[PDB]
Amino acid sequence: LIARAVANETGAFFFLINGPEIMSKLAGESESNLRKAFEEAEKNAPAIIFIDELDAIAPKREKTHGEVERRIVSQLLTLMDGLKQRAHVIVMAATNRPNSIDPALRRFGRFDREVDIGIPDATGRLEILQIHTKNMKLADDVDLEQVANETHGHVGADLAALCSEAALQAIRKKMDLITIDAEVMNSLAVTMDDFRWALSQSNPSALRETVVEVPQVTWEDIGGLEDVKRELQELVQYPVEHPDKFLKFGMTPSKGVLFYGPPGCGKTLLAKAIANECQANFISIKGPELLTMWFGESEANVREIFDKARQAAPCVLFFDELDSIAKARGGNIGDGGGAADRVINQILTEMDGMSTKKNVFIIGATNRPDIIDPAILRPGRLDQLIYIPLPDEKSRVAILKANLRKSPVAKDVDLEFLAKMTNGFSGADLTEICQRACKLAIRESIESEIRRERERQTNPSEDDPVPEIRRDHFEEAMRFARRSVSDNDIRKYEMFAQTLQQSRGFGSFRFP
Amino acid sequence: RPNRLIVDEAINEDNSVVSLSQPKMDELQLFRGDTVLLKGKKRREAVCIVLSDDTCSDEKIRMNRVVRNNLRVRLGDVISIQPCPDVKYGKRIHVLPIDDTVEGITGNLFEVYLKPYFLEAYRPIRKGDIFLVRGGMRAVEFKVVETDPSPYCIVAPDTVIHCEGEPIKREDEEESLNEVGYDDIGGCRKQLAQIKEMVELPLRHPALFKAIGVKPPRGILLYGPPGTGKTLIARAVANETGAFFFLINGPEIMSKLAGESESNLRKAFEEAEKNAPAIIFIDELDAIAPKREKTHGEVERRIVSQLLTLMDGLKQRAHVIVMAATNRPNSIDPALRRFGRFDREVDIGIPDATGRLEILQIHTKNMKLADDVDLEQVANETHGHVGADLAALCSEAALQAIRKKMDLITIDAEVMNSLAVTMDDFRWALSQSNPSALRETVVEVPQVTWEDIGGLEDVKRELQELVQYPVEHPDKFLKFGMTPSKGVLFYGPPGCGKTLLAKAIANECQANFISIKGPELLTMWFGESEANVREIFDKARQAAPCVLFFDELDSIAKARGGGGGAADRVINQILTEMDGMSTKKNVFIIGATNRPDIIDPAILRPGRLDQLIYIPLPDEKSRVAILKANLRKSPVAKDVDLEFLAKMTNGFSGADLTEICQRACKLAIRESIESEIRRERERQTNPSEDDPVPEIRRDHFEEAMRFARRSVSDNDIRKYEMFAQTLQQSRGFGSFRFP
């Protein structure tokens, strides 16, 4: 669609080469078809030759077993090289991944410009839904924003299928009741019922794909930590907002930072917030992914990750648990080996090879800064160490408000008081309290609905019993509230930070 | 016009019964037994008895395939329903067999087929109607070429029921009942409904879809173990929708010479194009287009590319749906699963006990089974049987009966009808079964209920809140803006009903239940096949709503010692799959572990098995319920006081109570066998009855309690209680009151 739209809007002649179609033809006929396509593009220049499923024609040389396949790949390379004489003919080609095709095609003069379409974000999904529902008559009930937010893992073909499924659900509903009359279609409409049913029946095709998008988190979602906000700004926003200042003062922007602190205190929230403030893409590498690379010895994939971060820049590449592999080896005492491991070694290799001009910022997070490999805290690496402590009262209030944003909460509740009485609670604990309150409210609502329906059953002869989460709901939820971070863990983190700070003497330094 | 009604699938198998929804006969003013002359296409009339039912929709009329065919209508069509009081009885009806259906049956065809039909059953018969009599083990079609009070008559004992020989030739516009239909398919009612909803609109209303201008389903990939009748499903869908059916056989295509295979594929797609709307079924798709790695020759890749090209070119073909059969989604080239290709998918899977019973009824439909057989018992005992396996089992039972008859003794139909299969034959066939899907993962709604495990009311409430509420009240969760919990972790002494609890909660929500035992996790760990975890979750995703149960999450931790950390490859993959699990899908993860201490902490984080539920040893009421459930299928003397037995079994796990019940049952069996041996020995020594032990007596339970052991020591209970108390003590802040 992108290639055809570009050709149509620029007025260029569009020629489509389907890889499977080329490979379907007998030996020699594939070469003839490729040559004829390129000749036709030459004749109608300016032209765009779009090769769909390029990996079908020219996969990795290992995947090309037959001699005719290699001959076809060589013919494609020859045509790409001969483009030099072919006046203003551009060849676009679709592929699943850059490594899916023969590397010889990615050389200069051949497919050298590359664009990663990737997966649409919530805004992108909303745009796609609006495009595919343009003709569709939709009831005022449907808000495509909610569908876009809920359609994670969809690519656009998935969204088109979802819209078609909703339309067909509506048509099925209105078909048994009733060449076909367009008045029925105008009357026909789709509601959130149809769209939610389609969402339930939809099978996203890009759930495994890495998410690369600007996070919707903001500094308000995590109050307090103003000093951490300032440090993150200086380390991410300034190099991208004011490269001129860094050039003038001749400083190299820091490549990354390492968050350390109690679990579930908002390190991920902080990384997403700083990515959002700079409107930079955010890539999250969770601890399970690092452990998957370590167990499977797939540390090569680390390179791919960084490529992704390089491809979508400026970026905040976030490693949720850098100590995950260290813990998996024992961590506190570990095995007989040292702190170095294959996956973290590859991370260091990629960080060293990162061009600072690309504005890709690495943020590591760890609840065990002691067991992190020291080689990653060196200059030119995650040199800065930032302590993310347990949220303070203002931070707790902000976290509670952020959690209770999609939940209708009675004005009677004093979130300020609740935050006041939750000293020592991590953000995870506050989220647990809010979820418990929502659980109690939902249970009360369902029980009241059951009682009402039973009353109707016993008496054939309506308002929401509980439309909001009430003061009593939170009071009950606080009974199950627990502090996941004990005072001993806080002491450990405070001792680590104090050890780091004590070495920072020489503060009584003054020029003469 | 009230007479307009939509044809629908029948429940009752009678060929002259049309069911109607309860609020509709009154509107049309019927009498639950009145003769109604339904009108269909081609100016076809069929007179039938109108029954009543609840499941039927107000505007829907349930019709069996025979009445549908003689009315020249299909499911979803519109027919005119109106009473036919002028249905007076008749004197002579000239029925005649169809040539095809009696091609090899010799006999009277009356007192065997036409007599049991119409006997004590006043079936209204219209001239030209074709009715099916399923007797012996054939299904004979009989066409009424003449009735004395034409066109409609009622068969009565005072009727000639005249018939002759010379079977007539089936006319062009007659769809032989031997053709596959939805009634010929069992064990995939859910998947069959999915496929029907997918393909009915594009096929039943092609031009309406074209003017519609919305994307139709192009490729439907039915996977599941072989023998589940996927070809049967496709053929039935094509027949019931009137769509042209073209069968492409993978091996047949690959057998042809290079180029001839391409020509065959192209010609198949062209033929489907011509006779649109059409269904192209590609049986054994993996044969044509396996994983590219499996494909070696140039011709193989060329034929795969040709198939992809045809699938992509479907866009210009008039309402042609391509269905393909495969063992697993990964068995075929990934390029086939792209959009514009086999993007729609259905997992037929192995049938469940209900599905197995449906299949057995379908395959024994013609069989003149003895009254002794209860197909429910066979369906319950045929675990691991695909539809093909059950067909083979029914065939083997019939062959056993035929062999016995031949030993007692082109063939007379009377003895064939007399020939009856008994539960002895079915059990013999079950012994010589060799099911083909014993190792396939079982995905079904468990039959366990909360009654099988009494007590644990708080655990019942938690499980309900965590599983039933999100699937039964999504609106509430949306309103309150809560994300349903992804899963829970049961912990407690072994054999205390954790599996029972998971199965019970799955049953209450009528959700599929997938059990992953500790040996499976250890197999993935030892073989380093943790990738299989993904497949498991995929399966669970395919069967949503589902309760994915991990019986021993600590199995790998135990296998490692219970020097490294708690992380391991298999549990790491479980974490990865759980994180990538969309909460919109109602897949609920339940983990069970006798050793919560050695469980990887990463699994207990929010967004994972965050809730920890302690399943203690059964209390007295739970013990009574466990004893009752264990002995449900065992004849137990009324003298036994299960309440007293539960009272005296404090500290016993559910496994211990099951052991006691099994010990008593085995003692009773031993006593029965010894008494029978003694009785036959006496008969031999004194040739010269009643069951010596018809039930498990109280003495048997008293003897069994001698060997009764407490599998869970007080120290283990202390450990679990200490764990629970450590969890609880952290949950302070109870004295929190808003100002």
Residue numbers in the entry:
A (entry chain A): 253 to 430, 436 to 718, 724 to 774
B (entry chain F): 22 to 430, 436 to 588, 593 to 718, 724 to 774
Provide the publication's sentences verbatim.
The AAA+ ATPase valosin-containing protein (VCP)/p97, known as cdc48 in Saccharomyces cerevisiae, is an essential and highly conserved protein involved in numerous cellular functions, such as regulating protein homeostasis, endolysosomal trafficking, membrane remodeling, chromatin regulation, autophagy, Golgi formation, and others. Its core function is to unfold ubiquitylated proteins in an ATP dependent fashion. Previous studies have established that post-mitotic Golgi reassembly requires presence of VCP, as well as two adapter proteins, VCPIP138, and p4734,35. VCPIP1, also known as VCIP135, is part of the ovarian tumor protease (OTU) family of DUBs, an essential family of enzymes that remove ubiquitin tags from proteins to regulate protein homeostasis and function.
Two-dimensional (2D) class averages from initial cryo-EM data sets revealed the typical hexameric structure of VCP with additional blurred density visible at the carboxy (C)-terminal domain of VCP, indicating significant conformational heterogeneity of this region. To stabilize the complex, we used BS3 chemical crosslinking prior to grid preparation and cryo-EM data collection. From this sample, initial 3D reconstructions revealed two binding sites of VCPIP1 on VCP. We obtained a consensus reconstruction of the VCP-VCPIP1 complex at an overall resolution of 2.3 Å (see “Methods” and Supplementary Figs. Using TR-FRET experiments, we assessed the effect of nucleotides on VCPIP1 binding and find that the absence of exogenous nucleotide behaves similarly to the addition of AMP in the complex, suggesting our complex is nucleotide free in line with not observing nucleotides bound in the structure. We also observed that the complex is highly dynamic, including within the N-domain of VCP and throughout VCPIP1.
